[PDB]
Amino acid sequence: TPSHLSDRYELGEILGFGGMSEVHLARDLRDHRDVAVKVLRADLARDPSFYLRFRREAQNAAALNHPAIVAVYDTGEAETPAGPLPYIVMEYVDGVTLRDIVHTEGPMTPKRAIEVIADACQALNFSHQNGIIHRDVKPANIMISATNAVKVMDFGITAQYLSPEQARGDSVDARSDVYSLGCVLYEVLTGEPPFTGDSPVSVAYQHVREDPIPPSARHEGLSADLDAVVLKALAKNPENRYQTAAEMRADLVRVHNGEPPEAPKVLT
Ligand SMILES: Nc1ncnc2c1ncn2[C@@H]1O[C@H](COP(=O)(O)OP(=O)(O)OP(O)(O)=S)[C@@H](O)[C@H]1O
Numbered sequence: 537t538p539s540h541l542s543d544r545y546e547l548g549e550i551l552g553f554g555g556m557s558e559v560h561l562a563r564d565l566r567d568h569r570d571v572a573v574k575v576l577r578a579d580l581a582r583d584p585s586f587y588l589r590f591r592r593e594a595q596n597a598a599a600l601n602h603p604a605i606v607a608v609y610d611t612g613e614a615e616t617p618a619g620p621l622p623y624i625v626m627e628y629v630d631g632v633t634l635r636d637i638v639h640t641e642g643p644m645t646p647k648r649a650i651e652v653i654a655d656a657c658q659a660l661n662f663s664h665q666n667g668i669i670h671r672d673v674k675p676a677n678i679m680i681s682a683t684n685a686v687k688v689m690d691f692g693i694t695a696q697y698l699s700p701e702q703a704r705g706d707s708v709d710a711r712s713d714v715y716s717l718g719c720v721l722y723e724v725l726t727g728e729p730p731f732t733g734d735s736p737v738s739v740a741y742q743h744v745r746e747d748p749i750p751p752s753a754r755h756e757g758l759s760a761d762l763d764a765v766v767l768k769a770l771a772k773n774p775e776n777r778y779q780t781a782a783e784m785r786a787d788l789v790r791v792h793n794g795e796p797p798e799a800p801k802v803l804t
């Protein structure tokens with residue numbers, strides 16, 4: 537895989553592999569800065585499907601300026617000994633994604649989890665302000681730096697993180713992001729997503745039919761007040777969940793600070 541492509545970026549160590557890309561720590565030679573480069577895998581690149589899937593999700597990833605949002609810098613596709621390799625250049629986050637944490641460290645401590653997801657609401661909310669719906673909220677798209685800073689990425693453009701309105705092919709709004717962010721919060725508190733199945737279609741059915749089991753019913757140490765917040769964000773009807781990311785944050789802040797949520801009590 538490439539030592540130095542674009543003649544502008546010198547790719548370094550692999551920071552990690554995602555479902556369809558290797559992410560390198562490159563060095564921007566022109567602006568003299570450390571940067572992250574997400575390159576489509578060479579094996580998946582000789583497959584027009586993935587090539588186009590990456591190429592689409594590359595020019596469509598929103599570039600926003602926010603301390604909690606990963607800034608996109610460049611996009612392109614250089615010729616390498618493996619054909620073209622589409623790539624996206626972005627802010628280097630020294631840390632891991634929530635997925636990495638869930639599958640290595642395990643379930644986060646409630647207060648820390650509440651903080652992380654509260655900080656993600658800040659980014660989601662700012663995005664909503666600019667009229668941009670993320671519509672792809674999941675653990676692998678939310679990062680935590682070495683300085684505990686929350687960095688969210690891939691705005692614009694995942695089987696068990698989609699909203700009932702997404703699973704029905706309907707429209708998508710701020711409330712849709714709330715539901716998905718709620719799924720991330722659920723998993724990060726308990727250890728597993730709200731809904732799991734033997735096939736994507738199974739999970740999609742569970743999303744728009746089956747109710748979520750209270751987080752505390754799945755993991756030890758989770759307050760009932762936390763159930764209220766989580767489960768409200770997982771409400772099937774958009775009008776039942778939080779209307780804005782700020783609203784959800786306002787409620788996480790309360791639970792965090794040992795205050796009663798404005799979310800309907802989870803009873804029986
Ligand atoms: N902006 C970044 N800065 C530093 N490291 C990153 C950055 N983005 C991703 N990484 C690392 O690369 C790994 C994979 O990144 P992903 O975004 O999950 O790749 P992906 O192919 O888009 O996977 P998906 O989103 O599930 S399709 C992560 O676990 C991180 O360690």
Ligand SMILES: [Mn+2]
Nearest residue numbers: 554676677690
């Ligand atoms: Mn991705």
